[PDB]
């Protein structure tokens, strides 16, 4: 859906900005510094679930640029496994949110954050 | 969820970039220049539906900036009506996509696009 590679870069950077906001805004809740409203979090994690599937289609062939390392393309199977592990951890976070349990939410939240960082460590320029 | 007003601006600009891509990528389909896959469009419009609810929470009090006109805040009821008309037209587009009918899709698509432009004409700086 991108006329030029710059358009895919702009897309993925916007998707990740959104995804970072919907993930990160829950930090005060999982730390206990903001109240835990199970319905509020369930609804936010549903938004996060939709957003977290979006970046990966915007790393198609020929869309080198931004802070993406070229290894995303030359090691595509390994990149796909990092994105699928991440997505699997988002499924786990959805489960916790749907269960309404702050203990499970905080554990699932930490797993997701670990998966974000692991991908960045391998595939994001510094 | 925004530490500073700049963060709300960055959010809404990223949300609209996404929303513009999920709307605009259907232009070749509704013009007949790309094939119509009812399931493909249904799934894309579901993504668009989620994204099209996101910008409005990022125009909260004190988040003046970007290309937002100050009238968004001083005429809040009129801005809310433009965003709700837009959202209602997205419901209509979802209905058409869910029905699998290219004729209805193209009409609903044009209604949504009209609603985007009407808001920009009143509330977006040029
Ligand atoms: C690989 C499978 C990744 C996972 C999982 C996550 N991120 Fe990521 N991120 C990745 C890349 C390759 C890049 C660079 C994209 C580019 O072309 O520039 C990024 C970048 C970011 C950014 C910066 C976005 C920008 O506005 O320029 C942020 C804020 C970010 N990523 C956040 C983030 C979060 C919160 C994640 C888990 C919930 C996450 N990423 C996962 C690769 C991957
Ligand atoms: C008011 C109810 C709006 C509706 C409906 C739509 N848009 Fe909009 N848009 C609006 C404002 C006030 C602004 C400026 C935001 C800012 O703070 O800068 C915008 C901006 C855009 C942009 C530019 C985003 C950027 O990256 O800076 C685009 C591409 C855009 N809008 C697209 C768009 C589409 C496709 C819409 C209908 C599907 C749509 N907007 C509706 C206000 C409103
Ligand atoms: O909110 C975020 O969380 C991840 C990471 O900091 C987790 O360690 C990331 O890259 C963000 O912007
Ligand atoms: O794709 C878009 O459609 C609307 C508008 O052009 C409809 O007239 C807009 O502002 C876009 O970026």
Brief rundown of the structure:
It is classed as electron transport. 2 copies of one chain form a homodimer. Chain A has 126 residues and is mainly α.
Map the helices and strands.
Two copies of one chain form a homodimer.
Chain A: H1 5-24, H2 27-30, H3 38-52, H4 71-74, H5 76-99, H6 102-123
Helix pairs in contact in A: 1-3, 3-5, 5-6
PDB class: electron transport
Keywords: electron transport, haemoprotein, 4-helix bundle
Assembly: dimeric
Describe the structure.
Two copies of one chain form a homodimer. The first copy, chain A, has helices spanning 5-24, 27-30, 38-52, 71-74, 76-99, 102-123. With 126 residues, chain A is mostly helical. Chain A has one domain: Cytochrome c/b562 (Four Helix Bundle (Hemerythrin (Met), subunit A), Up-down Bundle). In chain A, helix 3 (38-52) runs antiparallel to helix 5 (76-99). Chain A starts with a helix and ends with a helix. The interface between A and B is medium-sized, with 17 and 17 residues. Chains A, B: It is found in: Periplasm. Chains A, B: Keywords: Electron transport, Heme, Iron, Metal-binding, Periplasm, Pyrrolidone carboxylic acid, Transport. Chains A, B: Heme c binds at residues 12-13, 67, 116, 119-120.
Features of the shown structure:
71% helix; homodimer; cytochrome C'; 126 residues; 4-helix bundle; haemoprotein; 6 helices; mainly alpha; binds heme C; elongated; dimeric; electron transport; Four Helix Bundle (Hemerythrin (Met), subunit A); binds ascorbic acid
């Amino acid at each position: 859906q991108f006329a030029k590679p710059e358009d895919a870069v702009k897309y993925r950077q916007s998707a990740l900005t959104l995804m970072a906001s919907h993930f990160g805004r829950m930090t005060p809740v999982v730390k206990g510094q903001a109240p835990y409203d199970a319905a509020q979090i369930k609804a936010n994690v549903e938004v996060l679930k939709t957003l977290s599937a979006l970046p990966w289609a915007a790393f198609g062939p020929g869309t080198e640029g931004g802070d993406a390392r070229p290894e995303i393309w030359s090691d595509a199977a390994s990149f796909k496994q990092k994105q699928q592990a991440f997505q699997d951890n988002i499924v786990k976070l959805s489960a916790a949110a749907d269960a309404g349990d702050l203990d499970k939410l905080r554990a699932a939240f930490g797993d997701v954050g670990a998966s974000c960082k692991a991908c960045h460590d391998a595939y994001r320029k510094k």
